[PDB]
Design a binder for these strands. Structure first.
Length: 176
DNA sequence: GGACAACGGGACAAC
DNA sequence: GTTGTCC
DNA sequence: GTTGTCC
């Protein structure tokens, strides 16, 4: 896929926000825009993008079988590259040129951890996880674990989560 | 003596 | 750093 | 990769 200016990327996301659905036992379920979070370099406001990234919050676990494996896009032609229950990669045709689209899934109780994970950047994410590792924790896109056990942080947002683990909050674009 | 699908360790890849 | 999908 | 199971 080609390179995208930040604003080009914001147009695709805006366009797609009302246009993703999934086929669920024949029926065609539309995905709410309130349940889509733009992530990746887009969310970090980088000048140029290699991917458009969209994290989908799925309401109930039983749907992971159905959302990305049956994902559908109103209007737009595209091909599937790789796809599964938690990561789908699509090459969308958009104005006589093709770009790469990464859809990811998180459940509701994983939401902050997933936005944290997928917002990146990779450098920022490694150095944080290295420090928690040294304190015998593990952090991924689903939770914080100690002794192979979820740590039930009483948090809801990314901002709260970041601070609850012992880090200051930075807007997405100042993460490094 | 070629043409499939099932399996899964490791390549590649998502941030 | 940690996990996902592929053949 | 490898084995299986058809032709």
């Amino acid at each position: 896929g080609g390179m995208l200016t930040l604003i080009q990327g914001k147009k695709i996301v805006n366009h797609l926000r009302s246009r993703l659905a999934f086929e669920y036992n024949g029926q065609l379920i539309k995905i709410l825009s309130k349940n889509i979070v733009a992530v990746g370099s887009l969310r970090r406001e980088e000048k140029m993008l290699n991917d458009v990234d969209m994290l989908i919050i799925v309401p109930e676990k039983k749907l992971l079988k159905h959302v990305l494996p049956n994902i559908r896009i109103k209007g737009l032609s595209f091909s599937v590259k790789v796809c599964g229950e938690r990561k789908c990669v699509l090459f969308i045709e958009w104005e006589k040129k093709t770009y790469q689209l990464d859809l990811f899934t998180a459940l509701a109780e994983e939401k902050p951890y997933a936005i944290f994970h997928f917002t990146g950047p990779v450098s920022y994410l490694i150095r944080i996880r290295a420090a928690l590792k040294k304190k015998n924790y593990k952090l991924n896109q689903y939770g914080l674990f100690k002794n192979q056990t979820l740590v039930p942080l009483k948090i809801t947002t990314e901002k709260e989560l970041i601070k609850e683990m012992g880090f200051t909050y930075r807007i997405p674009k100042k993460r490094l």
